[PDB]
Amino acid sequence: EIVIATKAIGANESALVTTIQDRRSYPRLMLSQPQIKDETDTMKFKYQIRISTEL
Amino acid sequence: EMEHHIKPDIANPWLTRQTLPLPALSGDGTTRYVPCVPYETHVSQRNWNHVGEYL
Amino acid sequence: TKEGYGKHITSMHVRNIFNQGNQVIRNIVKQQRYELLDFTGTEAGTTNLPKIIPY
Amino acid sequence: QCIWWRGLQNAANVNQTINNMIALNTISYGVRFLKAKLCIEVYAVTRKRLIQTGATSYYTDDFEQGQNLFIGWADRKAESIPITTPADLDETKLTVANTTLFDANNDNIT
Amino acid sequence: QCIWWRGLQNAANVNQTINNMIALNTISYGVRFLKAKLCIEVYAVTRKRLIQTGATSYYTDDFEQGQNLFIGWADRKAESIPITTPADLDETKLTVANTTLFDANNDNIT
DNA sequence: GAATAA
DNA sequence: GAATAA
DNA sequence: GAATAA
DNA sequence: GAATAA
Questions:
Q1: Which H/E stretch holds residue D73?
Q2: Cα–Cα distance between D61 and D46 in angstroms, integer?
Q3: What are φ and ψ of residue A16, in 5° steps?
Q4: Which nucleotides of I are covered by protein (CB under 7 A)?
Q5: Calpha distance C28→C30 (Å, rounded)
Q6: How many alpha carbons lie under 13 Å from residue B37 in its C-beta half-sphere?
Q7: DSSP letter string over E16-27?
Q8: Min CA distance, D44 vs chain E (Å)?
């Protein structure tokens, strides 16, 4: 959260870049199927999808 | 008074992010002098008033 | 058509009923103690000296 | 958690938005990622229907519009994505073993 | 009727809520169970479709979204769950013989 | 912002 | 005081 | 300040 | 009571 770092700026100089920032928990995200026991193990699903990711 | 913030319902060893260790003294010293500083002085971010020099 | 009868039944929205690790318990450590302060002695902590409260 | 927003898992996924980005990272001293919006679109949900007589199996894929893709969140559990290569991170081929959005015991997934 | 709310049918089903509970049962002289809310969620209804020519059968599981899980209540009849082991009580493998939510004669189940 | 913050 | 409390 | 902040 | 009188 509290950043304390040294950026080089070449050899002759330095920057003690130093900030505070708000904490972000980023969970894990997953794309999975239903788990359905078949006579043999799980049913197998395969999804046709379009992810759309813009930043 | 203490609010004991109890554990998640699921392990997060990575949850120590917002945990801090106490101000415990660390060292081999059998005797340790725990500091007491009487006061935190108040200083101003205010500029002056009733200063005779005109500027 | 997908339909069924029930009581206290609803279309299934997001349910994860584990908290995201936010919970707070509050106890007060309570330590009443009858004590004596003896300055009448020559031994160690019994003297003319101020006896300390190490909060 | 990583940055796949450039679409690294294949170098085939570059659009001028990435190119525009590179030219800006050249003329820029610094940047902020202001917002990141992801939208999944499901065109199909298709299971493989397995018809098994003893000692034989007939395979066919069949549409299930009564089922759906689970987008899991791990909000109860500390977890990590292993990352190796820009390909190793892909919405598809990326996995962790012994991982299921459904546990017989404590389902830790929202 | 029993207590499976701890999830005994497998020791694999313990969450800190159970652990929190144990530590409270240690520091506590007494307890009340204030409310117990159960919620079933049905992700799928899947029959095994049996295709039978004479002297052979083809098996496949197929989604029925026109069918549904019956949650039965025995409100007309005196009945008991046999219990033996913490496993013997499971939402799945636990049964009583000659028991059906549908009787050809008097259907005693709400 | 009786323990001096013009 | 759909599960019968006149 | 469905993911427990009394 | 721009030359500092809180």
A1: strand D70-74
A2: 6
A3: -95, 70
A4: 2-6
A5: 6
A6: 3
A7: HHHHHHHHHHHS
A8: 16
